[PDB]
Amino acid sequence: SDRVAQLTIGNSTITTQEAANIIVGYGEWPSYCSDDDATAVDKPTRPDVSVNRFYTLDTKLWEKSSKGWYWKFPDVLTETGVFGQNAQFHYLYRSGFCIHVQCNASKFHQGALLVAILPEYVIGTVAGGTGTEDSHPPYIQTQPGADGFELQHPYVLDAGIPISQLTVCPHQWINLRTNNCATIIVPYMNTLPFDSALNHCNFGLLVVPISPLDFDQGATPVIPITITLAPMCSEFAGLRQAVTQ
Amino acid sequence: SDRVAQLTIGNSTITTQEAANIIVGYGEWPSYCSDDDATAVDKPTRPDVSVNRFYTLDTKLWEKSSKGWYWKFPDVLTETGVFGQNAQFHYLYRSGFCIHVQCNASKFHQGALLVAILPEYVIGTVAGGTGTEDSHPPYIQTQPGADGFELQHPYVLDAGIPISQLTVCPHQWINLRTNNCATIIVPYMNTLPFDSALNHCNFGLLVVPISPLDFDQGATPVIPITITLAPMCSEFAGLRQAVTQ
Amino acid sequence: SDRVAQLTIGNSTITTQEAANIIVGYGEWPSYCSDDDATAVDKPTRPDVSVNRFYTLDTKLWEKSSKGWYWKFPDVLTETGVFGQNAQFHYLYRSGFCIHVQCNASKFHQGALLVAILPEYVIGTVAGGTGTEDSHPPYIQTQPGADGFELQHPYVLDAGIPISQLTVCPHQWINLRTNNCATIIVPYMNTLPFDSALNHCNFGLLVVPISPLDFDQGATPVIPITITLAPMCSEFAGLRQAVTQ
Amino acid sequence: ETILEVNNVPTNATSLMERLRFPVSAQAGKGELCAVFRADPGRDGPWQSTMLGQLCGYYTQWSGSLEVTFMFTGSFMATGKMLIAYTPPGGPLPKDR
Amino acid sequence: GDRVADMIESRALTQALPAPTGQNTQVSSHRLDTGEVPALQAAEIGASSNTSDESMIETRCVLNSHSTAETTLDSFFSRAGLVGEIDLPLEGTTNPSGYANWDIDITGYAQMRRKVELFTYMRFDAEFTFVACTPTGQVVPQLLQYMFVPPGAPKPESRESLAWQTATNPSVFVKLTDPPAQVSVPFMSPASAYQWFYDGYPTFGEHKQEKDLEYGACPNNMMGTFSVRTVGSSKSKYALVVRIYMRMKHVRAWIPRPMRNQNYLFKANPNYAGDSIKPTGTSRNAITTL
Amino acid sequence: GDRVADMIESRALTQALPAPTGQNTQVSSHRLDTGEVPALQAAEIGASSNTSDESMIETRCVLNSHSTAETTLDSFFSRAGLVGEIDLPLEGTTNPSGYANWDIDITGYAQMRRKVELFTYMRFDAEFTFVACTPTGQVVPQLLQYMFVPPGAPKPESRESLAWQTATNPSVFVKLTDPPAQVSVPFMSPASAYQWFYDGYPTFGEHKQEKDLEYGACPNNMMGTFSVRTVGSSKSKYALVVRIYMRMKHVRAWIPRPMRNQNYLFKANPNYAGDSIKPTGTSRNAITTL
Amino acid sequence: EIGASSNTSDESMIETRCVLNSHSTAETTLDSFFSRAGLVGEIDLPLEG
Amino acid sequence: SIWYQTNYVVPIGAPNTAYIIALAAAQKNFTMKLCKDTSHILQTASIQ
Numbered sequence A, B, C: 001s002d003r004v005a006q007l008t009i010g011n012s013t014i015t016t017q018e019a020a021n022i023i024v025g026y027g028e029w030p031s032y033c034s035d036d037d038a039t040a041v042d043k044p045t046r047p048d049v050s051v052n053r054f055y056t057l058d059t060k061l062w063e064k065s066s067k068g069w070y071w072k073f074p075d076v077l078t079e080t081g082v083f084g085q086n087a088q089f090h091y092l093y094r095s096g097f098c099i100h101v102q103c104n105a106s107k108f109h110q111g112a113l114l115v116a117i118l119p120e121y122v123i124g125t126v127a128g129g130t131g132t133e134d135s136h137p138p139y140i141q142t143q144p145g146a147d148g149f150e151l152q153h154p155y156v157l158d159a160g161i162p163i164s165q166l167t168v169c170p171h172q173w174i175n176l177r178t179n180n181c182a183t184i185i186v187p188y189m190n191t192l193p194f195d196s197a198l199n200h201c202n203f204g205l206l207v208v209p210i211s212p213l214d215f216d217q218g219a220t221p222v223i224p225i226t227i228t229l230a231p232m233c234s235e236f237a238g239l240r241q242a243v244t245q
Numbered sequence D: 001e002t003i004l005e006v007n008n009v010p011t012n013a014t015s016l017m018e019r020l021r022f023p024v025s026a027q028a029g030k031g032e033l034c035a036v037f038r039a040d041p042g043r044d045g046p047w048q049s050t051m052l053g054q055l056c057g058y059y060t061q062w063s064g065s066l067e068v069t070f071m072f073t074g075s076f077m078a079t080g081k082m083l084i085a086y087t088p089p090g091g092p093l094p095k096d097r
Numbered sequence E, F: 001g002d003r004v005a006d007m008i009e010s011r012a013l014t015q016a017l018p019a020p021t022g023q024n025t026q027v028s029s030h031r032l033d034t035g036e037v038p039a040l041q042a043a044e045i046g047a048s049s050n051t052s053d054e055s056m057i058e059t060r061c062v063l064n065s066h067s068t069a070e071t072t073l074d075s076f077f078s079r080a081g082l083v084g085e086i087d088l089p090l091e092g093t094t095n096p097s098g099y100a101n102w103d104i105d106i107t108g109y110a111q112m113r114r115k116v117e118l119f120t121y122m123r124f125d126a127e128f129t130f131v132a133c134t135p136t137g138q139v140v141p142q143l144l145q146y147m148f149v150p151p152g153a154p155k156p157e158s159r160e161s162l163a164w165q166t167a168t169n170p171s172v173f174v175k176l177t178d179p180p181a182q183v184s185v186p187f188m189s190p191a192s193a194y195q196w197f198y199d200g201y202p203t204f205g206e207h208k209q210e211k212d213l214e215y216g217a218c219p220n221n222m223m224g225t226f227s228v229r230t231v232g233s234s235k236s237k238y239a240l241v242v243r244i245y246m247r248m249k250h251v252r253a254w255i256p257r258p259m260r261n262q263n264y265l266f267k268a269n270p271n272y273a274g275d276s277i278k279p280t281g282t283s284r285n286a287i288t289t290l
Numbered sequence G: 001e002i003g004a005s006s007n008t009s010d011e012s013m014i015e016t017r018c019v020l021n022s023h024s025t026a027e028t029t030l031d032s033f034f035s036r037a038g039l040v041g042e043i044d045l046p047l048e049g
Numbered sequence H: 001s002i003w004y005q006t007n008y009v010v011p012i013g014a015p016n017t018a019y020i021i022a023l024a025a026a027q028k029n030f031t032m033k034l035c036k037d038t039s040h041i042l043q044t045a046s047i048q
């Protein structure tokens, strides 16, 4: 009654029969902006079906020597579907997300992942190596899009913060002896109630193998990791022509 | 709701998630000596935490050609901890026992054990082979202590009684396809309500592989058997200086 | 009705028929730790008979030129009996003490003693004689055990405090024309409600002849002083393996 | 709950992710020591990675019981039993199980 | 006088139901039902299986009136079995002077010993009977004195001794023309049950090889010495045997245990033949035949 | 769930009466009475004698209105005594670079130490005051930073260190033209009382001669380090002293003990001079004179 | 792997006593952790430089 | 201290070396007091 689930929203459902449990980030569901909070005076659009779908984005192969990946949300979906068309026309934006990452393996493979969220995941550099040149990260390390980006130094998460206490932020583990998926429901976290969808990326989805993959030779050596996400309770405002960046 | 358990008493707990069930020996829990039964007229000591602990004693390796082992209780614990200090100071003694024997294996290993109790397990010898010389067993075969002792002829249990009807006495099986542990709760069985802890050994824990261990070569060849026991409702009387034997 | 007494606790009693009176140190009996005071969250052991006994420890001969002795409690009983076994297994400890010191003499001998308690009796040295070298006392002067230790300079009690105002602390006199024993009941005095029994010695029993022994030659020249003590309301916590020091 | 680094042995920059987890393996024997660590969040050691041990770095004195959770990340069909023993103070590093 | 809440807070699972007859078999029918299965048990629990007849086969209403009174302990043990034999020969080595001290150990013959070794602790009254005769079988006009020597009483050392005055010991004077002397004996042990098995030593101290003779010897079971002499100053002119039969009554037995399958070799120890460990049953050449 | 009667059956003698003034003396007369004697006490009981004035001498009615408020612990201890002195000289050996770490041990001066060593356990709040000046006495326009380093915080190692940023430590910035900086300090110890005497060792293990330095050192009493620097990157042009005065308030003291009579020699140990044990009083040539 | 901190208490792991915990949690609030004046800026106004 | 109680048994085809991740937190009776500055100072030079 906990191992088996089904998440239907929009026209797309996903079934899982070896889940762990759904955690709701910071204990509350995504919701619409109340009139106590809103400052924009134009009526928002709320598509309510066409953008609240599980978008399956990409597939990272996980071998025995991987480091970890990250996806900046919502810039994984400003190139995809009716979410990517409404977020490019409209200046303002708010939504929550239901984030579901699948990674199946046999009952002989082993290894654990820490799929975790963290809001305002800013990216530092190696500062020129020795630490004296103020190098800023490029635009693709900042906002990789639906392609994702691989961590260089996952012990410090490319930001000088340790991964050992990433477990404070909303997370759950995918260890291949127990579960194969990890649902994380995230509300809209930001100070101001709407923001731009092209500039500001509210959070980043860190997916790091902490305990590495291991399997005896003869088993299937290709163990993919696919993340599917669904913008919940999304609404846009401030209509103008299409910007792409 | 039966496969998973937890036995906490004292400051030590043991968890098991592939148990069979707890059997209570002869249908009753260990209890204190009532004033209808007691004959000693000094007030007993009852330590109630410091001696009601799961003492993990030893580790017998079980290979494909083993015979069986036995431990004489309570002489496995007259050398260990605050039980071994209270039983050496005090002449009288009574307690029950919660006896938990672990033996894990993979889902490819096979084999079954008969971990059984029997009260007043007296030990015979081979009578000089042909059966004409009255040989008595030595002190180490009689009371091996926490080291245990291996059975010579397990079909007759070194006492001329067959193991085929050992299943009368309180027992349960560890077959490695179903369970990995076997809890046996034993009350205090003896005629007189207290007795000496150094001379009289109330019962013996026979642990005999009946169906032998078997596994194809490549699996883990070291399959240990560890027994943990907890004196429940123990009380001592008759304080004097320390005897060791 | 005051000269004759009997102190039975545990399985051991002592009779006295020329006592003075029992004084209770600081006006209160030893008691168990209430739940307003306790901070440890494991259930304490309370042996209640096996450790609340009058342990007769040693015998100091008192001649005409003695200085005085001291015993650090409870380190006189961390080598003796079931108290010495429970205090070596358990980290925490609290108890009171009933301290009874016997010294009989004839009706022609004379002399007086000041058997007194004092809590936190720390020991200084002679500072290298002239008083310029920071010498610390050795471990045997600090904690002599059941053997006791003889005072070097009893006028300053080896601590720079005069014996003339030791009479503030709980005490009573053994002058050989009136009494032959001195019962001092001491509660548990320490800041924190339990402490270690191997490191911290709560108080010291100073037994100093102030008025010296005197007798004409022909009388019995051997006048012993034996101290017997009984831990009252003792309880231990924090079970681990045996430390001895 | 927050990742305590019991395996605080490796130090070079290419193997700092080795610290977060410590190995178990098929022993050929009886009761071997897997890992041992100090159980106090103030002392320099394993507890400096957890947020219990770094918010306690701002406070001089702490109290209360504290929990340690061990997640086994092996395969499905690999079983075993581990003994996780907390020794109270005074008692030294234990020599056998 | 406490403020703590730890001290102020500081039983059988089975009920003996009356069962005079074996239980009836109620009518069952077929069942085609998932979910519940009465056949598939778990024998690794260590419980005997509670599967009945009705949930395995279609049965009829059988009113079982078969009594279970023959199988009680008072009907299984109250049969006088041979537990001792005392020889009083005319000339020989074994008791040549017409007295014999037979210490009461009823584990000397393997039919009474085999039954009472099924249980560990037994508490019972007994009535002993002393059938005495010449070794050829015939009865002779000879007077005998049996007497019971408790632990501590003086053992009689000869026929014409002083301990046969029986000032406080119980004694029986029967001649052989009479019927066999039958006396009842109470439960005399200091413990609450005669334990047939005492895994332990009676005395403290170091336990070397010279004093392993005490192993298994409990003083709560050895209840004295039974002495018998031919009443007279002269020697009697008849060789004698005295067979001792005892039946147990008012029996309470505790803690069953496996029944002996190897031959008995000695008294008061379970020593068995080492090279001659025989199987507990008969055998056959193959398993797929009969 | 017990049938035993042993487990189911399993406090101060003195009452604090209010006494604002010393007690009155009621009128007594003579008494010529046998049987009862108020003079003859028994000092071997170990009790102070309860003999009053009235039962030794004919007294008058004296209404004693002498208050006992000056002798309470809050009036005996709430006086600011010198417990520390910190030197910040221009050039020298002892702190030549304008910082000083003085760990808070108030047993360094023998007037405040002598009073608070009367009691064993004391629990108190304190208000420290830091009177700072040039060694000639005059005040100079110099800015100082005091900061309190608890056990575990980084000790500042220089004047221009990073630990002087005081992100969480409490710190006081006062210049010497100002009045003395006075801050109040709570009861900070982990134990329930600052014990002035700890007969024991803090750590376990064997106790050899090399680590007898820990004897008498309790961690519940050492409460950190008080650090002071002249605020600036350059060196200050004024030699400085900082005298620290503390008075105790909200005082609770337990377990009195004899007051020191030998000279103090070191901090945190009662070591005394061995050849120079002086008597606790003055002396006279004979006992029968004055 | 749920991603929840464990709700196992003291009482269901070890035999415990009644401890009335009166240890206050007021020092750990945000208004007591942050209301300390820390050095956040330094401004130099030198004579010549 | 963490001790093997029986073993770590595997079938053929499973990896014979597994990894345990140790997570740690406090209970609900955990309190702290007397706030101070931390022991590590995360700065060496002037932060530019």
Ligand SMILES: *[C@@H]1O[C@H](CO)[C@@H](O[C@@H]2O[C@H](CO)[C@@H](O[C@@H]3O[C@H](CO[C@H]4O[C@H](CO[C@H]5O[C@H](CO)[C@@H](O)[C@H](O)[C@@H]5O[C@H]5O[C@H](CO)[C@@H](O)[C@H](O)[C@@H]5O)[C@@H](O)[C@H](O[C@H]5O[C@H](CO)[C@@H](O)[C@H](O)[C@@H]5O[C@H]5O[C@H](CO)[C@@H](O)[C@H](O)[C@@H]5O)[C@@H]4O)[C@@H](O)[C@H](O[C@H]4O[C@H](CO)[C@@H](O)[C@H](O)[C@@H]4O[C@H]4O[C@H](CO)[C@@H](O)[C@H](O)[C@@H]4O[C@H]4O[C@H](CO)[C@@H](O)[C@H](O)[C@@H]4O)[C@@H]3O)[C@H](O)[C@H]2NC(C)=O)[C@H](O)[C@H]1NC(C)=O
Residues within 6 Å of the ligand: A063, A065, A066, A067
């Ligand atoms: C002029 O001149 C110049 C100079 O020379 C030249 O140049 C050149 O070029 C060429 C061309 O390109 C080249 O060659 C190439 O190479 C490549 C590479 O290699 C390298 O690298 C690798 C990598 O690694 C990785 O991975 C692994 C696993 O796999 C792991 O383990 C590791 O760790 C790593 O990881 C990493 O990375 C990743 C990525 O992804 C990530 O993720 C992670 O994170 C990490 O970081 C490596 O390994 C290698 O190494 C090597 O070396 C070393 C030394 O030191 C050693 O030790 C090792 O062992 C190795 O060796 C081996 O190997 C190799 C291979 O690799 C070989 O060759 C050798 O011999 C040996 O054996 C390196 O470094 C590669 O890849 C390639 O190969 C390919 O090709 C060939 C022909 O061509 C063949 O034969 C092979 O087989 C292969 O094939 C494959 O692949 C493909 C593509 O990919 C595919 O499609 C296919 O299908 C196949 O697959 C298959 O098979 C396999 C087996 O192998 C299996 O597994 C699977 O499943 C399937 O079935 C090539 O070779 C070169 O290099 C250069 N040079 C140099 C010097 O380098 C030029 O050219 C000229 N010009 C003209 C015009 O000519």
Ligand SMILES: *[C@@H]1O[C@H](CO)[C@@H](O[C@@H]2O[C@H](CO)[C@@H](O[C@@H]3O[C@H](CO[C@H]4O[C@H](CO[C@H]5O[C@H](CO)[C@@H](O)[C@H](O)[C@@H]5O[C@H]5O[C@H](CO)[C@@H](O)[C@H](O)[C@@H]5O)[C@@H](O)[C@H](O[C@H]5O[C@H](CO)[C@@H](O)[C@H](O)[C@@H]5O[C@H]5O[C@H](CO)[C@@H](O)[C@H](O)[C@@H]5O)[C@@H]4O)[C@@H](O)[C@H](O[C@H]4O[C@H](CO)[C@@H](O)[C@H](O)[C@@H]4O[C@H]4O[C@H](CO)[C@@H](O)[C@H](O)[C@@H]4O[C@H]4O[C@H](CO)[C@@H](O)[C@H](O)[C@@H]4O)[C@@H]3O)[C@H](O)[C@H]2NC(C)=O)[C@H](O)[C@H]1NC(C)=O
Residues within 6 Å of the ligand: B063, B065, B066, B067, D028
């Ligand atoms: C003078 O002279 C003299 C005369 O010679 C000499 O003497 C000598 O001495 C020496 C020294 O000591 C010796 O040698 C040695 O030996 C030993 C023994 O052997 C024997 O025994 C065995 C046993 O068995 C058992 O077990 C099994 C299993 O394992 C089973 O199956 C069976 O059944 C059994 O069981 C039983 O027992 C048990 C016990 O525990 C119980 O429990 C049960 O119940 C039962 O009862 C046996 O087996 C053997 O056998 C043999 O032989 C036969 C004939 O008949 C055959 O058939 C067989 O097969 C065998 O053979 C094989 O093996 C062997 C071995 O064993 C080899 O050698 C051969 O070659 C073949 O291969 C016998 O009888 C042993 O043990 C040893 O060995 C060792 O060492 C070596 C060198 O030194 C090496 O190389 C090896 O490898 C080994 O090593 C191992 O071990 C160790 C110890 O233990 C360890 O530590 C290590 O680590 C190792 O382990 C490893 O490996 C393995 C493989 O092997 C594996 O498995 C594992 O896992 C790991 O990895 C030695 O060799 C001898 O003996 C003697 N002699 C005679 C004749 O004997 C003297 O010395 C001189 N002097 C001078 C001065 O020099």
Ligand SMILES: *[C@@H]1O[C@H](CO)[C@@H](O[C@@H]2O[C@H](CO)[C@@H](O[C@@H]3O[C@H](CO[C@H]4O[C@H](CO[C@H]5O[C@H](CO)[C@@H](O)[C@H](O)[C@@H]5O[C@H]5O[C@H](CO)[C@@H](O)[C@H](O)[C@@H]5O)[C@@H](O)[C@H](O[C@H]5O[C@H](CO)[C@@H](O)[C@H](O)[C@@H]5O[C@H]5O[C@H](CO)[C@@H](O)[C@H](O)[C@@H]5O)[C@@H]4O)[C@@H](O)[C@H](O[C@H]4O[C@H](CO)[C@@H](O)[C@H](O)[C@@H]4O[C@H]4O[C@H](CO)[C@@H](O)[C@H](O)[C@@H]4O[C@H]4O[C@H](CO)[C@@H](O)[C@H](O)[C@@H]4O)[C@@H]3O)[C@H](O)[C@H]2NC(C)=O)[C@H](O)[C@H]1NC(C)=O
Residues within 6 Å of the ligand: C063, C065, C066, C067
């Ligand atoms: C080489 O060379 C070297 C050099 O010389 C050598 O060395 C040597 O050695 C030796 C041997 O050891 C030695 O000898 C010895 O000595 C010893 C010691 O003496 C010393 O000391 C003492 C002590 O005192 C104490 O005590 C008292 C009482 O008693 C008191 O009074 C005091 O005060 C003191 O007190 C203190 O101490 C204590 C202890 O306990 C404490 O407690 C307290 O607190 C305090 O502090 C002393 O006294 C002495 O003195 C002396 O001297 C002086 C001079 O100045 C004078 O004045 C005096 O008077 C004295 O003298 C006298 O005495 C002596 C004795 O003592 C004599 O001898 C003389 O002659 C005179 O008379 C000193 O200083 C001792 O002890 C010893 O003696 C012993 O022995 C002998 C022989 O041997 C004998 O004869 C004697 O008698 C004795 O005996 C006794 O003892 C024992 C043991 O203890 C016993 O057991 C016995 O039994 C006896 O007892 C008895 O008797 C008695 C009488 O006496 C009585 O009382 C009782 O009761 C009983 O009956 C010895 O002598 C030496 O010294 C060294 N040297 C030098 C110089 O020193 C070497 O050896 C070489 N080598 C080789 C090889 O040879």
Ligand SMILES: CCO/N=C/c1ccc(OCC[C@@H](C)CCN2CCN(c3ccnc(N)c3)C2=O)cc1
Residues within 6 Å of the ligand: E104, E105, E106, E107, E126, E128, E146, E147, E148, E170, E171, E172, E183, E185, E194, E195, E196, E197, E221, E222, E223, E226, E267, E268
């Ligand atoms: C004129 C007077 O006539 N008197 C007759 C008469 C008859 C019998 C009698 O006492 C009968 C004692 C039996 C009832 C029980 C014998 N028992 C107890 C258990 N035990 C055991 C236990 C463990 N190991 C061994 N070897 C032996 C054993 O042998 C006393 C007096």
Ligand SMILES: CCO/N=C/c1ccc(OCC[C@@H](C)CCN2CCN(c3ccnc(N)c3)C2=O)cc1
Residues within 6 Å of the ligand: F104, F105, F106, F107, F126, F128, F146, F147, F148, F170, F171, F172, F183, F185, F194, F195, F196, F197, F221, F222, F223, F226, F267, F268
């Ligand atoms: C800007 C920030 O301004 N901060 C000022 C400031 C002032 C004081 C302060 O803490 C005062 C501590 C005292 C009240 C008690 C000192 N105590 C306790 C018992 N003890 C003992 C016990 C046994 N042996 C020895 N040697 C010594 C001892 O010395 C902290 C901070």
